[PDB]
């Protein structure tokens, strides 16, 4: 039924007969870079809406995350790979793209790859270290300002402090509802507060011993809230970068302990080189001294009792050593082997 190629999204019936194609309306790379991972794009949608108004209620994509996003969007769809659509589309490319079909596949293909791949650099590990440092710095400011926000807004609603101990909520409240007199039930609901808490709040609001604030007083505090909110976004951007850059810098390390923890190792070590030069023993206790061993945040370790931990940390540090080496020299992806081995030895420790 529904498949894609380097030019656009095509639709086929049950006999392999085209129904309605739909060429990409933005650069092919930009679009495919999403449709491939299962995300739905502008063009994919219109193609669907159009098939709907043509007596079609059944859809089948070649990617699950796609069909999943499809149904929750309104279209009941299944998932089959390779579906009749793609099988046709990949068997006879010229039938849909021309005689120079391969030169098109080559064009977009390359474009898409240059998009996805970062350009060479001699200091991206250094760049990852700064992002991790920035992330910590940003956490430090979020707390300093959120404290200020609580202390200040509590002059006007001291009770809200304890009822919204989760900062993101407290921040969204101040920013969204503003003056305590805008507290409805639908706004407190729109913030996603449990119907029970909405009661404790609305209730505490009527008995509130706080001072009066006028529009000017409230606006300045909302400015603060907005800024904490923009700081929460920056944080996400730093995480997002760390994640993307770690793919160029240390894909093996990322696959083993995740992009953030990996980035952290590199930072504690001073560079990917430095990390590669360390022995299992040093990686095992890297970043800690009560704090001990940053690699202990490893899910397999943490979920275990202190006496079962050390053994595992050893197995991990040994794998991290190999990963750090190959990441520093070639970048060749070997973490899957590394992971299998480590997963098997951890089952022994239990």
């Amino acid at each position: 039924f529904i498949s894609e190629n380097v030019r656009g999204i095509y639709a086929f019936d049950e006999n392999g007969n085209l129904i309605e194609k739909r060429y990409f309306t933005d650069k092919p790379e930009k679009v495919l870079d999403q449709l491939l991972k299962g995300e739905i794009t502008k063009d994919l949608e219109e193609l669907l809406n159009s098939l709907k108004e043509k007596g079609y209620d059944e859809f089948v994509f070649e990617h699950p995350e796609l069909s999943r996003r499809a149904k929750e969007l309104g279209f009941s769809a299944t998932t089959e790979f390779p579906n009749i659509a793609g099988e046709r589309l990949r068997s006879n490319p010229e039938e849909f793209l021309g005689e120079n079909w391969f030169e098109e596949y080559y064009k977009v293909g390359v474009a898409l790859t240059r998009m996805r791949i970062q350009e060479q650099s001699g200091a991206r590990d250094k760049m990852v270290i700064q992002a991790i440092e920035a992330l910590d710095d940003v956490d430090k400011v979020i707390n300093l300002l959120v404290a200020r926000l609580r202390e200040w807004y509590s002059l006007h609603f001291p009770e809200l402090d304890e009822l919204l101990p989760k900062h993101p909520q407290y921040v969204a409240f101040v920013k969204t509802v503003g003056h305590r007199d805008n507290i409805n039930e639908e706004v407190l609901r729109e913030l996603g507060l449990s119907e029970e808490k909405i009661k404790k709040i609305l209730e505490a609001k009527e008995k509130t011993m706080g001072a009066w604030m006028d529009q000017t007083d409230i606006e300045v505090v909302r400015q603060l809230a907005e800024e904490i909110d923009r700081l929460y976004q920056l944080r996400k951007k730093l995480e997002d970068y760390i994640d993307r850059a770690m793919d160029d810098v240390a894909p093996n390390l990322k696959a083993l302990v995740g992009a953030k923890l990996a980035a952290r190792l590199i930072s504690l070590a001073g560079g990917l080189r430095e990390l590669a030069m360390m022995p299992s023993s040093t990686i095992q206790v890297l970043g800690a001294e009560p704090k001990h061993g940053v690699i202990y945040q490893y899910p397999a370790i943490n979920r275990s009792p202190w006496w079962q931990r050390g053994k595992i940390a050893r197995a991990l540090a040994g794998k991290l050593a190999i990963a750090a080496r190959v990441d520093y020299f070639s970048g060749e992806y070997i973490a899957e082997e590394l992971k299998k081995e480590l997963e098997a030895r951890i089952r022994e420790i239990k």
Binding site: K37, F81, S91
Partner: protein
């Protein structure tokens, strides 16, 4: 005393030089272009690249007397684990301007080196991807004649089958370089190769198996055909 001569396989050439030794080689599809610091010798107005078996698995296989070599000129090949393109640059030479090569590679810093090469060697489409999730590059490739796999992955076996039952032309060939200790570091190599071949027989018609010694330790190149 450099001298070149044809080889059993189309695209492959035999060559013996000064040291009296004999070596493998291919016809440089993009004259003047070097991919991995390979050795190049001009025969007669034409350029030949010495296919080093120490840098390429496929190379070692040929040098070790590989029997079946599905990669012929004009063929389309889905290369999983294209890495830098060292050994894929030779299949380019072979497959020629009518041949097509969809190269998949998970590690971007690795796949990056190949990109500049494909500019003039518009024979290969460098695709950043994960061989375990063939769907994520379904729109970038078309059914191929041959699938060549060389991935450090335990799942190696299914990977070839997954990619074959999605992009391999029926009655099509498949070549996978299997590393025993990648599948099971504990089990015995011969014990492993026996299972990888069994698993592969459930979908393919295992047409050959060749060991890569002395070039690779505990490595085996299998060739199979799609029913």
């Amino acid at each position: 005393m450099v001298e070149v001569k044809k080889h059993k396989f189309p695209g492959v050439y035999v060559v013996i030089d000064d040291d009296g030794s004999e070596k493998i080689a291919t016809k440089n599809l993009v004259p003047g272009q070097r991919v991995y610091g390979e050795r190049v010798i001009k025969w007669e107005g034409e350029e030949y690249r010495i296919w080093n078996p120490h840098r390429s698995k496929l190379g070692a296989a040929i040098v070790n007397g590989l029997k079946n070599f599905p990669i012929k000129p004009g063929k389309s090949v889905l290369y999983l684990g294209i890495a830098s393109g060292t050994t894929a640059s030779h299949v380019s030479d072979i497959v020629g301007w009518e041949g097509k090569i969809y190269g998949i590679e998970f590690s971007p810093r690795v796949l990056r080196e190949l990109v500049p090469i494909v500019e003039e060697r518009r024979n290969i489409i460098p695709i950043l991807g994960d061989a375990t999730k063939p769907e994520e590059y379904r729109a970038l490739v078309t059914k191929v004649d041959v699938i060549f796999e060389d991935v450090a992955q335990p799942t190696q076996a299914k990977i070839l089958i997954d990619n074959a039952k999605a992009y391999l032309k029926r009655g099509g060939y498949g070549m996978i370089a299997v590393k025993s200790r990648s599948i099971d570091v504990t089990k015995e190599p011969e014990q492993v190769f026996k299972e990888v071949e069994r698993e592969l027989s459930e979908y393919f018609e295992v047409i050959e198996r060749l060991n890569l010694e002395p070039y690779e330790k505990d490595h085996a190149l299998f060739v199979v055909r799609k029913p």
